[PDB]
Amino acid sequence: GPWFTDGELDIEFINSLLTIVWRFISENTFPNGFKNFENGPKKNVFYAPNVKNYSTTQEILEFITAAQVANVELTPSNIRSLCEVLVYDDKLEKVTHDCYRVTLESILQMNFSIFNYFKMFPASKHDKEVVYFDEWT
Amino acid sequence: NLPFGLGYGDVGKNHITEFPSIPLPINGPITNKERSLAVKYINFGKTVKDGPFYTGSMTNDGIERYSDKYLKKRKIGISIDDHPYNLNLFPNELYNVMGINKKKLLAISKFNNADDVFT
Amino acid sequence: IFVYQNNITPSAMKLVPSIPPATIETFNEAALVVNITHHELVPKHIRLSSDEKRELLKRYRLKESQLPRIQRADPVALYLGLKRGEVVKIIRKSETSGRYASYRICM
Amino acid sequence: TTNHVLEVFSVLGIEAARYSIIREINYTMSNHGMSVDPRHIQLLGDVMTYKGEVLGITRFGLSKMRDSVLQLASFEKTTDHLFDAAFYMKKDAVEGVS
Amino acid sequence: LVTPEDVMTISSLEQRTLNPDLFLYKELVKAHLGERAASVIGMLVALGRLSVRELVEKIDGMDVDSVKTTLVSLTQLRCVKYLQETAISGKKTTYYYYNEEGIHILLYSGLIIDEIITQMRVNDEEEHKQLVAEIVQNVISLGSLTVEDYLSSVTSDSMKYTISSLFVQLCEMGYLIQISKLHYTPIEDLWQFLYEKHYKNIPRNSPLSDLKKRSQAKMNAKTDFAKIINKPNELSQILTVDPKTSLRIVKPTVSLTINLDRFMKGRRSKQLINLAKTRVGSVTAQVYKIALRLTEQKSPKIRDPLTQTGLLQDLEEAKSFQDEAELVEEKTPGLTFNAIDLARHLPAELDLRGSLLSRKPHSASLINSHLKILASSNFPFLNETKPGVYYVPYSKLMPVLKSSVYEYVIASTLGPSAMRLSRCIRDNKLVSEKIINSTALMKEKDIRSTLASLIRYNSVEIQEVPRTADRSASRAVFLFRCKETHSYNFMRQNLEWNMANLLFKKEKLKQENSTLLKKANRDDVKGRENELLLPSELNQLKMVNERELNVFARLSRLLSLWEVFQMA
RNA sequence: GAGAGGA
DNA sequence: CGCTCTGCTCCTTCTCCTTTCCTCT
DNA sequence: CAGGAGAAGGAGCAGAGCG
């Protein structure tokens, strides 16, 4: 594959491509973009349900072609596989007919409610009664 | 047969951690609302320990003394039987141990919303 | 007592021991031609009631789990139709000792 | 009457099986001219036929007679008996001579 | 190096062997009831269905009176579910089970009081919030209460009227229900009893067919089973209207307890709101929250229609349950709602004007549009019954909620790559390492590392395909599946054990430093800590209290994290 | 360890 | 009325035992 | 290296009920 380096699948180029595709999808699927979240979740607005907030694979192809960041020719199937990989981690929510619109969690994690675990702080040092996931295994 | 992805340097001693190193994110500092729950978790529990339904247990000399006399009883212990009971719920065989014929007395577990935690 | 002729379907055997108050038993016609109790090697069995069993247990200071048991479906047990926990007294005859009594229970 | 003890047990109860065991052992040891008291033979028959069914003196017939795990392990099939007693968590009370 | 003589002391290895259910139940009962009750509950969990004689035999504290006092203590607090069966052959015997709902009630006490206070719009008035908190505290601590005793405890007529009104309001809301012998009968044995008296009564003539006879018996039994299950939830006791002054008053003689099913439905609503807060805006989350609060009372039970536990599911007709549930899930009159009701009940503090952008207050159209955007997402937050009519599908929302919670727990504990691998294996099916690399786009070294670290739990299962006569390695291939049921069950057990460990540590710390804790209440010196005790005692008491506070906060977090796996 | 008396 | 599970019963292929020890070499 | 005896899976039919 075009994404292999020295016979192995490198991640740095893949991570950069994932980041730029994710940012493009987020900008396309939100009213104004990241500047809708500088104030916080208390004022952000969202697109109407009837609008086409998603972004098909072809839009991603056009953006990556006009950006010239991948620096190599990428087929629509390869970009589809890449954005399907990005579908995991609760990013790039999948919509029928090969459409993508970023999840709200993906932009919430850029900065009890277990879902937003990134906000919670690690336990203090030399503290007892701290819960460990593998304490029973 | 050493595997492809291993070398002799990393093998030789079998050190298992025996201590956890993967913590859940629930260990963060408490919040004011969480501090409330606790109190309604420490208070409850405290009330039932003071409650008549405990039977938790799994000086006292027989010599009469004027010192122990003129001293008040510690409290008015409320046993399990004295509590009012809905007889139709319990099994029949336990009737011999309850207060089937005993003076009615019910204790009210008052709730103090003010925290009893120091500072 | 159901004396079947030649063969019993296993489903019938499954249905046999499902009656709380009463009970039924199966006897092959071939299995009933000469009664077992009249064979020379079969000693005289006697069914002991509850009172006799209690007397025996008090006399020998035993329990119901220590006497030499006799299996249920034993040909001389199902003949008398002993229920589980019934003591049978056996008049065993030996040439060097005459007659003597040995006790069994149905398990 | 047949020579086979188990056949007599199947067709004539367990008491007839005990009688057959005693009589056949006595006949075998009398045809050979040896003088063994019949009371020992009777004790052997009773030992074989007191659990309810005819039980041999192999490692299979002993496992259905003696509960003591240590005795059975000492006799035959040691590790299997010890592991079974560990699994089923048997609680033998040491009273046998072994 | 840590010697084993120290590992056995400071590694929590002795308790690591206890069964999580037995550990948690025994620890809870020991903390809230005592040691005799803990022993009895431990015997009940370990053996199951013990009579009084067997409980006496299996416990060193074999005092018959002690066992009976423990049993009445556990029954009034409904920590046990007895059963009175009659032996045909002779003397009848009564067998006791262990009641999971009562122990859960002991577990959710703080959360229960928080939900009671918050859901009823009485904390705002600030005057009867204390009254309702005391009411729920007494109900949950004493087990079962009749209103006349509580009213006779107080003297003021105004207080009596306020308490009676709060009782009526709470009973109407659904948090309080009449307690009957049905609450002290196992559901499995209840279904066993109801299977007869509908199968035995069939005449000895040819029944349709034996399979059809059993089908008729099951169909007849399910009806009255559901009827008797819902009988406590019919409000047949609150309607004692007009004894005087023509007001709605609860019947004095009827005993009332707390409805655990209602509280757990509230917990499920809160979990769904938290999930929705990660998919829609704050305003839309508020709309979903108020819709959940409106439909909460009429929602189906969290656990099951109580028929799943009763018997075998079916040959394959267990899907009928789903279908039947789905039918009620779509056709209970309270479930279906339109934007008009939400706008009627929506608080005025919500802007709901500029939240939605048309193209790249309390308006009915805007609320309908927000409901539409809720229903549009792949997560079935809402589903459309009629044009403009929505209902929250609980049947199709449990699996996605469980999957999301489990995936995020994996993401938080292990690396995010663990979540990526788990979701990749789940979306795919029986995927080799090469296809994993192709469809995950990361290093195979880290793929193998994460897979090995993840197989330690029942997250990813290895399927062995043997390519030789012997199934030994180096020739066979190894595919990977997920088996989400194994993962959910294992994580539920892990969380139960963690909660039990936290409670055990809390009780141990309370016992170790019990001297100054006892002194704090020896002479009613509470609130005078600084002015009577030595500074070292002050520091020790402060540390003990802070540790207990942290323990209970972590227990609340663990409860909020494991409720979802407890759902079904 | 295994080769063989031996009674 | 064939069809389709259970259930039973063969049938085959597997596992655990074979004094006493009493020496030397 | 022979001899004996159990436990465990395939495998081929009766038997029951059925839609």
GROMACS .gro file of N, CA and C in nm, chain B residues 3-91:
model
  267
  140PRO      N    1   1.138  -1.628   2.044
  140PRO     CA    2   1.054  -1.582   1.933
  140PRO      C    3   1.118  -1.469   1.854
  141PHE      N    4   1.053  -1.429   1.744
  141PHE     CA    5   1.110  -1.327   1.656
  141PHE      C    6   1.120  -1.192   1.725
  142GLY      N    7   1.019  -1.156   1.805
  142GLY     CA    8   1.013  -1.024   1.863
  142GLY      C    9   1.070  -1.012   2.003
  143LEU      N   10   1.156  -1.106   2.042
  143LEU     CA   11   1.214  -1.107   2.176
  143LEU      C   12   1.364  -1.129   2.169
  144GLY      N   13   1.434  -1.079   2.271
  144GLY     CA   14   1.576  -1.102   2.284
  144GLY      C   15   1.609  -1.150   2.424
  145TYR      N   16   1.730  -1.205   2.438
  145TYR     CA   17   1.771  -1.262   2.565
  145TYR      C   18   1.783  -1.158   2.676
  146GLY      N   19   1.799  -1.030   2.640
  146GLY     CA   20   1.810  -0.927   2.742
  146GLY      C   21   1.683  -0.910   2.823
  147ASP      N   22   1.567  -0.915   2.758
  147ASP     CA   23   1.440  -0.891   2.825
  147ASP      C   24   1.387  -1.012   2.900
  148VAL      N   25   1.451  -1.128   2.885
  148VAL     CA   26   1.407  -1.250   2.953
  148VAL      C   27   1.517  -1.296   3.047
  149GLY      N   28   1.478  -1.372   3.150
  149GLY     CA   29   1.571  -1.421   3.249
  149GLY      C   30   1.517  -1.416   3.390
  150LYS      N   31   1.431  -1.319   3.418
  150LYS     CA   32   1.366  -1.308   3.548
  150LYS      C   33   1.216  -1.291   3.528
  151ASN      N   34   1.138  -1.361   3.610
  151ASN     CA   35   0.992  -1.359   3.599
  151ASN      C   36   0.937  -1.265   3.705
  152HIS      N   37   0.939  -1.136   3.673
  152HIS     CA   38   0.891  -1.032   3.763
  152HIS      C   39   0.747  -0.997   3.726
  153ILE      N   40   0.653  -1.049   3.804
  153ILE     CA   41   0.512  -1.012   3.791
  153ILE      C   42   0.484  -0.902   3.891
  154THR      N   43   0.408  -0.801   3.848
  154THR     CA   44   0.396  -0.677   3.925
  154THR      C   45   0.336  -0.702   4.063
  155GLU      N   46   0.230  -0.783   4.070
  155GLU     CA   47   0.161  -0.816   4.194
  155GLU      C   48   0.090  -0.693   4.250
  156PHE      N   49   0.110  -0.578   4.186
  156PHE     CA   50   0.047  -0.452   4.223
  156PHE      C   51  -0.021  -0.391   4.101
  157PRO      N   52  -0.143  -0.341   4.117
  157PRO     CA   53  -0.214  -0.283   4.002
  157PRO      C   54  -0.147  -0.154   3.956
  158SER      N   55  -0.161  -0.127   3.826
  158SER     CA   56  -0.107  -0.005   3.768
  158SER      C   57  -0.202   0.060   3.668
  159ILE      N   58  -0.325   0.013   3.657
  159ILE     CA   59  -0.424   0.067   3.565
  159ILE      C   60  -0.543   0.116   3.646
  160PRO      N   61  -0.548   0.245   3.678
  160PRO     CA   62  -0.656   0.297   3.762
  160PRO      C   63  -0.774   0.350   3.683
  161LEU      N   64  -0.892   0.334   3.742
  161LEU     CA   65  -1.012   0.393   3.686
  161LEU      C   66  -1.011   0.544   3.707
  162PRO      N   67  -1.078   0.620   3.620
  162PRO     CA   68  -1.081   0.766   3.634
  162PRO      C   69  -1.172   0.818   3.743
  163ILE      N   70  -1.219   0.732   3.833
  163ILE     CA   71  -1.316   0.769   3.935
  163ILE      C   72  -1.245   0.815   4.061
  164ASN      N   73  -1.114   0.832   4.054
  164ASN     CA   74  -1.033   0.864   4.171
  164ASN      C   75  -1.008   1.013   4.187
  165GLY      N   76  -1.072   1.097   4.106
  165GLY     CA   77  -1.048   1.240   4.110
  165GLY      C   78  -1.102   1.303   4.237
  166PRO      N   79  -1.068   1.430   4.259
  166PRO     CA   80  -1.115   1.500   4.379
  166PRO      C   81  -1.267   1.509   4.382
  167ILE      N   82  -1.322   1.504   4.504
  167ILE     CA   83  -1.467   1.504   4.519
  167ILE      C   84  -1.523   1.643   4.492
  168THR      N   85  -1.652   1.646   4.460
  168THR     CA   86  -1.724   1.770   4.436
  168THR      C   87  -1.824   1.795   4.549
  169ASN      N   88  -1.879   1.916   4.551
  169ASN     CA   89  -1.971   1.953   4.658
  169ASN      C   90  -2.096   1.867   4.656
  170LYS      N   91  -2.152   1.842   4.537
  170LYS     CA   92  -2.267   1.753   4.527
  170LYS      C   93  -2.230   1.612   4.570
  171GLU      N   94  -2.114   1.563   4.527
  171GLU     CA   95  -2.067   1.433   4.573
  171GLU      C   96  -2.041   1.435   4.723
  172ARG      N   97  -1.997   1.548   4.777
  172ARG     CA   98  -1.976   1.558   4.922
  172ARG      C   99  -2.108   1.545   4.998
  173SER      N  100  -2.215   1.596   4.937
  173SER     CA  101  -2.350   1.581   4.996
  173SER      C  102  -2.384   1.433   4.999
  174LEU      N  103  -2.386   1.369   4.882
  174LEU     CA  104  -2.427   1.226   4.879
  174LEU      C  105  -2.358   1.160   4.997
  175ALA      N  106  -2.226   1.164   4.996
  175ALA     CA  107  -2.155   1.095   5.103
  175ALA      C  108  -2.230   1.117   5.234
  176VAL      N  109  -2.253   1.242   5.271
  176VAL     CA  110  -2.315   1.262   5.404
  176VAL      C  111  -2.442   1.178   5.410
  177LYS      N  112  -2.519   1.172   5.301
  177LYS     CA  113  -2.648   1.099   5.306
  177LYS      C  114  -2.614   0.952   5.291
  178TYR      N  115  -2.485   0.921   5.287
  178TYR     CA  116  -2.443   0.779   5.281
  178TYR      C  117  -2.379   0.747   5.416
  179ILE      N  118  -2.318   0.847   5.479
  179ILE     CA  119  -2.260   0.825   5.615
  179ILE      C  120  -2.373   0.833   5.716
  180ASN      N  121  -2.463   0.930   5.699
  180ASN     CA  122  -2.577   0.946   5.792
  180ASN      C  123  -2.659   0.817   5.784
  181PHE      N  124  -2.711   0.786   5.665
  181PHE     CA  125  -2.776   0.654   5.652
  181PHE      C  126  -2.662   0.561   5.687
  182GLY      N  127  -2.692   0.444   5.736
  182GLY     CA  128  -2.582   0.363   5.783
  182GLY      C  129  -2.554   0.395   5.928
  183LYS      N  130  -2.525   0.521   5.961
  183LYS     CA  131  -2.518   0.557   6.102
  183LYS      C  132  -2.653   0.538   6.170
  184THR      N  133  -2.761   0.580   6.104
  184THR     CA  134  -2.894   0.564   6.161
  184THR      C  135  -2.929   0.417   6.180
  185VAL      N  136  -2.896   0.333   6.083
  185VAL     CA  137  -2.931   0.191   6.095
  185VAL      C  138  -2.840   0.121   6.195
  186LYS      N  139  -2.716   0.169   6.213
  186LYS     CA  140  -2.634   0.120   6.323
  186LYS      C  141  -2.698   0.154   6.457
  187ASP      N  142  -2.751   0.276   6.470
  187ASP     CA  143  -2.833   0.309   6.585
  187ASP      C  144  -2.972   0.248   6.577
  188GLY      N  145  -3.011   0.194   6.462
  188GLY     CA  146  -3.142   0.137   6.443
  188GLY      C  147  -3.162   0.010   6.524
  189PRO      N  148  -3.288  -0.024   6.550
  189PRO     CA  149  -3.317  -0.143   6.632
  189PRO      C  150  -3.275  -0.274   6.566
  190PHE      N  151  -3.262  -0.277   6.434
  190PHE     CA  152  -3.230  -0.400   6.362
  190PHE      C  153  -3.080  -0.406   6.338
  191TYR      N  154  -3.005  -0.435   6.445
  191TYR     CA  155  -2.860  -0.446   6.432
  191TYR      C  156  -2.809  -0.586   6.465
  192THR      N  157  -2.833  -0.635   6.587
  192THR     CA  158  -2.780  -0.762   6.639
  192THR      C  159  -2.637  -0.786   6.592
  193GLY      N  160  -2.555  -0.681   6.595
  193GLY     CA  161  -2.423  -0.689   6.533
  193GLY      C  162  -2.328  -0.783   6.603
  194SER      N  163  -2.329  -0.784   6.736
  194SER     CA  164  -2.232  -0.862   6.812
  194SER      C  165  -2.243  -1.010   6.778
  195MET      N  166  -2.129  -1.073   6.752
  195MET     CA  167  -2.127  -1.213   6.714
  195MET      C  168  -2.125  -1.304   6.837
  196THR      N  169  -1.561  -0.402   8.620
  196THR     CA  170  -1.651  -0.395   8.505
  196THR      C  171  -1.746  -0.514   8.502
  197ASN      N  172  -1.876  -0.485   8.510
  197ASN     CA  173  -1.981  -0.587   8.507
  197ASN      C  174  -1.966  -0.686   8.623
  198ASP      N  175  -1.907  -0.642   8.733
  198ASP     CA  176  -1.890  -0.729   8.849
  198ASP      C  177  -2.024  -0.754   8.917
  199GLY      N  178  -2.037  -0.873   8.976
  199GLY     CA  179  -2.157  -0.911   9.048
  199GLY      C  180  -2.165  -0.859   9.189
  200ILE      N  181  -2.066  -0.783   9.234
  200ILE     CA  182  -2.067  -0.729   9.369
  200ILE      C  183  -2.146  -0.599   9.370
  201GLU      N  184  -2.244  -0.590   9.461
  201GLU     CA  185  -2.321  -0.468   9.475
  201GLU      C  186  -2.231  -0.355   9.526
  202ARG      N  187  -2.252  -0.236   9.472
  202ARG     CA  188  -2.171  -0.121   9.508
  202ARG      C  189  -2.258   0.004   9.507
  203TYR      N  190  -2.238   0.089   9.608
  203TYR     CA  191  -2.311   0.215   9.614
  203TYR      C  192  -2.267   0.312   9.504
  204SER      N  193  -2.148   0.292   9.448
  204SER     CA  194  -2.101   0.379   9.340
  204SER      C  195  -2.184   0.360   9.213
  205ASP      N  196  -2.211   0.235   9.175
  205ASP     CA  197  -2.293   0.212   9.056
  205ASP      C  198  -2.437   0.256   9.079
  206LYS      N  199  -2.487   0.244   9.201
  206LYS     CA  200  -2.617   0.300   9.235
  206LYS      C  201  -2.610   0.452   9.228
  207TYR      N  202  -2.727   0.514   9.211
  207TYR     CA  203  -2.743   0.658   9.189
  207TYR      C  204  -2.685   0.703   9.056
  208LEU      N  205  -2.654   0.610   8.967
  208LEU     CA  206  -2.606   0.641   8.832
  208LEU      C  207  -2.713   0.600   8.732
  209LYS      N  208  -2.740   0.688   8.636
  209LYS     CA  209  -2.849   0.666   8.542
  209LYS      C  210  -2.816   0.552   8.446
  210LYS      N  211  -2.921   0.486   8.397
  210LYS     CA  212  -2.906   0.390   8.289
  210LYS      C  213  -2.857   0.461   8.163
  211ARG      N  214  -2.776   0.390   8.084
  211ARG     CA  215  -2.709   0.454   7.971
  211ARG      C  216  -2.810   0.509   7.871
  212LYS      N  217  -2.914   0.434   7.841
  212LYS     CA  218  -3.016   0.476   7.745
  212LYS      C  219  -3.136   0.383   7.759
  213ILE      N  220  -3.236   0.402   7.672
  213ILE     CA  221  -3.355   0.312   7.673
  213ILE      C  222  -3.342   0.218   7.553
  214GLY      N  223  -3.261   0.112   7.567
  214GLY     CA  224  -3.237   0.021   7.453
  214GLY      C  225  -3.366  -0.027   7.389
  215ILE      N  226  -3.379  -0.008   7.257
  215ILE     CA  227  -3.499  -0.058   7.185
  215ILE      C  228  -3.462  -0.189   7.115
  216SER      N  229  -3.521  -0.300   7.158
  216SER     CA  230  -3.489  -0.429   7.100
  216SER      C  231  -3.559  -0.445   6.965
  217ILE      N  232  -3.532  -0.557   6.898
  217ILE     CA  233  -3.593  -0.582   6.768
  217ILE      C  234  -3.743  -0.606   6.782
  218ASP      N  235  -3.784  -0.674   6.889
  218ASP     CA  236  -3.924  -0.713   6.903
  218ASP      C  237  -4.016  -0.594   6.923
  219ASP      N  238  -3.969  -0.489   6.990
  219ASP     CA  239  -4.057  -0.377   7.025
  219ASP      C  240  -4.105  -0.300   6.903
  220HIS      N  241  -4.037  -0.311   6.789
  220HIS     CA  242  -4.078  -0.239   6.670
  220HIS      C  243  -4.212  -0.292   6.619
  221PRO      N  244  -4.301  -0.205   6.573
  221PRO     CA  245  -4.426  -0.253   6.511
  221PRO      C  246  -4.396  -0.337   6.388
  222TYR      N  247  -4.477  -0.441   6.368
  222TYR     CA  248  -4.454  -0.535   6.260
  222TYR      C  249  -4.583  -0.565   6.186
  223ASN      N  250  -4.573  -0.577   6.054
  223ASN     CA  251  -4.684  -0.620   5.970
  223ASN      C  252  -4.681  -0.773   5.966
  224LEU      N  253  -4.769  -0.836   6.044
  224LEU     CA  254  -4.758  -0.979   6.069
  224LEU      C  255  -4.778  -1.062   5.943
  225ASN      N  256  -4.859  -1.014   5.848
  225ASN     CA  257  -4.889  -1.093   5.729
  225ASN      C  258  -4.769  -1.110   5.637
  226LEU      N  259  -4.662  -1.032   5.656
  226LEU     CA  260  -4.545  -1.044   5.570
  226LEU      C  261  -4.452  -1.156   5.619
  227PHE      N  262  -4.421  -1.157   5.748
  227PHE     CA  263  -4.319  -1.246   5.800
  227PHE      C  264  -4.367  -1.391   5.802
  228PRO      N  265  -4.274  -1.486   5.797
  228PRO     CA  266  -4.312  -1.627   5.817
  228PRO      C  267  -4.363  -1.651   5.958
   0.00000   0.00000   0.00000
